[PDB]
């Protein structure tokens, strides 16, 4: 009949699809490129801007901009270009025919939701929409009604404790560390070894290096002692021009800054201490049930060994007599989408949508009272 | 008694002297020439290679090489020739008798420091040495404990914010624009007017043209409008063969590429935007005190009007209610040397030196833990 | 209806024709002769100067001048004679009726374009014209939108990298080595064997020797070892007076100076190293696609074995894991003309022409903003 669109704007990858299918059928980076060199050849079909995989393919000649930073949309015309490209080119669906479901990080400005709703109703003319919290959807995705969700994409990291489907909004922690600033840290430490990655394309190369070769040390000091004393830990990677580069302690040393944010120069504690300090904000009767479920979400939680390191140091912080269990399904990179795909297909949810009648009556202000 | 040597390797000029005197008594270009023509006359005392002012005097018959490019030493045997020439010929001091203090740009490879230390201990047998950050020394030189230093030599440009003597290493910005690639840009734009400077000697002629006739426009568009509409702005310069050449808008147009690196085809923003984006990485309590001190250093900051252009567009970027103050002493070309001359003469500093005992015990690896 | 003229001024050969035919129907040397001997016979119809094939036929009695040297037009009245001869005698077309398309090397003075446009509008009264870059047209001719073009005529050599129709103007390399100074080198090396070619006609004889008997060695040292040790490599050529001359290692030794310009006494590297140093100025994401297309153009690239020598030593310089491919179609001598013939016949291009309305409004200065 009619099936909601489910879209998660993220930072980096856009992933979008139809409710009740099991994985997104459009996935592509939320990136806009504009050409920066003087065009010479007449009659080339040269184009004002590129979106997604086009801007990845041509990125040699483009300045690449991300329109979303730390879950905040900084540039609105490029975000409209990314949605226009998503609906018409990637999904090939006219938005007037489908409710749309849109995803956002907690504790970010209200104007972001007001603008997202004003754009979806006024330009796209989407008949109905809703704005959902990223972390809540990871419980739908992992089959649970209870747990403290730890979520990290590109940009924002946040913890949200949930107990039998009630959020605990005084205990929500949010951290801007994850994912992009790991890449801007890797680019800085790689210079030590004599490699220089400055341009926005070289940042995408370093992002691919990070996704392939980084891993989390169980003990960071023992492994730095080992990697100072050996070549055994050292791996080499082939740049797009066929140069070859060799990477030593940097590969484990980059994601350790998740657990020691002082490396990049933040003043806040690692994800393990914000997780524990989030559980400490919950009333003592439920803590037993949060320690028994910790759910990782989003791509920055994909590093090898991050679960066993999390469980090890949370088991160091926690009282001795409890199971600490970290849940990290291999599909977790898509968990927020799979959870929104589940949510948008429920029948109980069909009363939750903001309809255009209500937006016309109450204006974009309505989103705050109707949505979370 | 014994007084440390203070040496700043730079790119282009070497400048060297004794600690606690006020200006370097050896200054000469870090250049090595080798003769390229067939020598005809028997018995001439013809010589395998020339260093410094010798290679400037004979440069008509020489290929000129710079052993340092973008603060990285690319060629080590010529760098050893330049240090051998500095100590024996320029200072006429035996290095075994004096601690040596050596200066480097931030964020450059570690192998450069390991090799510099291995050479100073093993070949020169210098009893003690230290490696100092170029930008840090400009504060010693300008009498301050706080400020964001902007430094540009030949090769590397870098910003380093310092607040009450603590560096902020996550906010250090480094840019490869300055000084040599301005000359390689001037040689390219001068061809437009019908002058061709290809050889390494002609590059030295263009460097002298740049140092005499270039200046920075307050408004680049107004002055291009003026120089299109008049002869008033036009200056003429006499080549070493007594030809005379005439230079128009090129003279302001060359150093504008410091503020618009897209001219040479870089993808990064000008020195004013890297200065502002460096202050934006500092915590909000100190920004007021960085805007109140900006310290220019190194010869590429000598262009007329570069201070008032910097202050004008930084005052455009900054919030309206703050003093922006640019500090640009007329001596700033020597500031890194004067600062190292101050530093090496402190009494507290006499425990900082790496001694040969420690190099023998720990090997050249020590430099990373003992030095910055 | 009306079809643009397409003209490439070169040095040496003029080649000209109508847009959208496939090869030029006028080809002749850009040479002007003036008689230098006392004329004896009364009533001969003796003529003040000769152009093109006339001056080749009578060259025994003429001083031959080239009005273009290193792509710069040095003598304007003779260049006007060459264009007058091209339009009226070779094409037999009145220039008022046809747009004209004119070709030029990059990085040469602007006064050359201003004068070319002032002459085409004021004296010829050509209704519309355009000035095109020589290297860009070789891609139109070779059916590509990407590649690093290496072009060598008589006079200037230049590299221009292009990627999907965007030039990379900071990476354009230009070299004055090619083609005429190979002939002035061949005349110098032939003297060691006892042949003396001084006059401007004897230079044309040496040019014909070079075009017939020269070839490029795969390995220059092995072939000099062979030609010192044998007669097997040796060829003989018959001068216009029926003398016969014999040429040994000189024939491969002449074009090796393209790869070792120090022979003639230049300080710059060979065409292979300027090609590699041009690819090194391009951002790392596109280099794979420039190594996969190298397009040779112009007559100086016609020597036998120059492609396999280029591919061999570029494959020595390049990273080991990449295809290096040299593209050298047998027609490449005409490629810049064939490319301009294609370009001038596009429909999108009919808005690119400078029309006399615009020249009247803006003066010859317009060429810089409208043309490349």
């Amino acid at each position: 009949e009619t099936t909601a669109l489910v879209c998660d704007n993220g930072s980096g990858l856009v992933k979008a699809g139809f409710a009740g299918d099991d994985a997104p059928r459009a996935v592509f980076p939320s990136i806009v490129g504009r050409p920066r060199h003087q065009g010479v050849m007449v009659g080339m079909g040269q184009k004002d801007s590129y979106v997604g995989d086009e801007a990845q393919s041509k990125r040699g000649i483009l300045t690449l901009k991300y329109p979303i930073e730390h879950g905040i949309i900084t540039n609105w015309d490029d975000m409209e270009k990314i949605w226009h490209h998503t609906f018409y080119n990637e999904l090939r669906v006219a938005p007037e025919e489908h409710p749309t479901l849109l995803t956002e990080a907690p504790l970010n400005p209200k104007a972001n939701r007001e603008k997202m709703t004003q754009i979806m109703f006024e330009t796209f003319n989407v008949p109905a929409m809703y704005v959902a919290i990223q972390a809540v959807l990871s419980l739908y995705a992992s089959g649970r009604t209870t747990g403290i969700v730890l979520d990290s994409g590109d940009g924002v990291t946040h913890n949200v404790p949930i107990y039998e489907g009630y959020a605990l909004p005084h205990a929500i922690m949010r951290l801007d560390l994850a994912g992009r600033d790991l890449t801007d840290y890797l680019m800085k430490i790689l210079t030590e070894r004599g490699y220089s990655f400055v341009t926005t394309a070289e940042r995408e190369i370093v992002r691919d290096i990070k996704e392939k070769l980084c891993y989390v040390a169980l003990d960071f000091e023992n492994e730095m002692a080992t990697a100072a004393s050996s070549s055994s830990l050292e791996k080499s990677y082939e740049l797009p021009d066929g140069q070859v580069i060799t990477i030593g302690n940097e590969r484990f040393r980059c994601p350790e800054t998740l657990f020691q944010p002082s490396f990049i120069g933040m003043e806040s504690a690692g994800i393990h201490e914000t997780t524990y300090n989030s559980i400490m904000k919950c009333d003592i009767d439920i803590r037993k049930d949060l320690y028994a479920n910790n759910v990782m979400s989003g791509g920055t939680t994909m590093y090898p060994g991050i679960a066993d390191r999390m469980q090890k140091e949370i088991t160091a912080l926690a009282p001795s007599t409890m199971k600490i269990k970290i849940i990290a399904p291999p599909e977790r990179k898509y968990s927020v989408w799979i959870g929104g795909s589940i949510l948008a297909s429920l029948s109980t949810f069909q009363q939750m949508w903001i309809t255009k009648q209500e937006y016309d009556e109450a204006g974009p202000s309505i989103v705050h009272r109707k949505c979370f | 008694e014994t007084t440390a040597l203070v040496c700043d390797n730079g790119s282009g000029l070497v400048k060297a002297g004794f600690a606690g005197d006020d200006a370097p008594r050896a200054v000469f270009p870090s250049i090595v020439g080798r003769p390229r023509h067939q020598g005809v006359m028997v018995g001439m005392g013809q010589k395998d290679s020339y260093v410094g002012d010798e290679a400037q005097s004979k440069r008509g018959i020489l290929t000129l090489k710079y052993p340092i490019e973008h603060g990285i030493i690319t060629n080590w045997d010529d760098m050893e020739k330049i240090w051998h020439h500095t100590f024996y010929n320029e200072l006429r001091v035996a290095p075994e008798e004096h601690p040596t203090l050596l200066t480097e740009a931030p964020l450059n490879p570690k192998a450069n420091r390991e090799k510099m230390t291995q050479i100073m201990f093993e070949t020169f047998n210098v009893p003690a040495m230290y490696v100092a950050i170029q930008a840090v020394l400009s504060l010693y030189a300008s009498g301050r404990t706080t400020g964001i230093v902007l430094d540009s030599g030949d090769g590397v440009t870098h910003n380093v914010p310092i607040y009450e003597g603590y560096a902020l290493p996550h906010a250090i910005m480094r840019l490869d624009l300055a000084g040599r690639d301005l000359t390689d840009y001037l040689m390219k734009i001068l061809t437009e007017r019908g002058y061709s400077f290809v050889t390494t000697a002609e590059r030295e002629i263009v460097r002298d043209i740049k140092e005499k006739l270039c200046y920075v426009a307050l408004d680049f568009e107004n002055e291009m409008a003026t120089a299109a509409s008049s002869s008033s702005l036009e200056k003429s310069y006499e080549l070493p063969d007594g030809q005379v050449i005439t230079i128009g808008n090129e003279r302001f147009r060359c150093p504008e590429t410091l503020f618009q690196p897209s001219f040479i085809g870089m993808e990064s923003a000008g020195i004013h935007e890297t200065t502002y984006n460096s202050i934006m990485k500092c915590d909000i309590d100190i920004r007021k005190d960085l805007y109140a001190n900006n310290v220019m250093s190194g010869g590429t900051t000598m262009y007329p009007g570069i201070a008032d252009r910097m202050q004008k567009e930084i005052t455009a970027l900054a919030p309206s209610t703050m003093k922006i103050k640019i500090i640009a002493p007329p001596e700033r070309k020597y500031s890194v040397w004067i600062g190292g001359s101050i530093l090496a003469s402190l009494s507290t500093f006499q425990q900082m030196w790496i001694t040969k005992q420690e190099y023998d015990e720990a090997g050249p690896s020590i430099v990373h833990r003992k030095c910055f | 209806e009306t079809t643009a003229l397409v003209c490439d001024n070169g040095s040496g050969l003029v080649k000209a024709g109508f847009a959208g035919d496939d090869a030029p129907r006028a080809v002749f040397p850009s040479i002007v002769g003036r008689p230098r001997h006392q004329g004896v016979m009364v009533g001969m119809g003796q003529k003040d100067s000769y152009v093109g094939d006339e001056a080749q036929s009578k060259r025994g009695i003429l001083t031959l001048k080239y009005p273009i040297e290193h792509g710069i037009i040095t003598n304007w009245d003779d260049m006007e004679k060459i264009w007058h001869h091209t339009f009226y005698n070779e094409l037999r077309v009145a220039p008022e009726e046809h747009p004209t398309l004119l070709t030029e090397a990059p990085l040469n003075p602007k006064a050359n374009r201003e004068k070319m446009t002032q002459i085409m509008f004021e004296t010829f009264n050509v209704p519309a014209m355009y000035v095109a870059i020589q290297a860009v047209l070789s891609l139109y001719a070779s059916g590509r939108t990407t590649g690093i073009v290496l072009d060598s005529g008589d006079g200037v050599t230049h590299n221009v990298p292009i990627y999907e129709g965007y030039a990379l103007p900071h990476a354009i390399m230009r070299l004055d080595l090619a083609g005429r100074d190979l002939t002035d080198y061949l005349m110098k090396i032939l003297t060691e064997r006892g042949y003396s070619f001084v006059t401007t006609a004897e230079r044309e004889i040496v040019r014909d020797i070079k075009e017939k008997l020269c070839y490029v060695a795969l390995d220059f040292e092995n072939e000099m070892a062979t030609a010192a040790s044998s007669s097997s490599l040796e060829k003989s050529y018959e001068l216009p007076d029926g003398q016969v001359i014999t040429i040994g290692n000189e024939r491969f030794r002449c074009p090796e100076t393209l790869f070792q310009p120090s022979f003639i006494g230049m300080e710059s590297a060979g065409i292979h190293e300027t090609t590699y140093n041009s690819i090194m100025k391009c951002d790392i994401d596109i280099r794979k696609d420039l190594y996969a297309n190298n397009v040779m153009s112009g007559g100086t690239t016609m020597y036998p074995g120059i492609a396999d020598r280029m591919q061999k030593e570029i494959t020595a310089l390049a990273p080991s894991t990449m295809k290096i491919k040299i593209i050298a179609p047998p027609e490449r001598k005409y490629s810049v003309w064939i490319g301009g013939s294609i370009l001038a016949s596009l429909s999108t291009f009919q808005q690119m022409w400078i029309t006399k309305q615009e020249y009247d409004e803006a003066g010859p200065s317009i060429v810089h903003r409208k043309c490349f």
Binding site: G194, Y195, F197, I245 | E69, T74 | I284
Partner: peptide, 7 residues
Amino acid sequence: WXAXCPA
């Protein structure tokens, strides 16, 4: 350098 730039 060893990768990005020429030094």
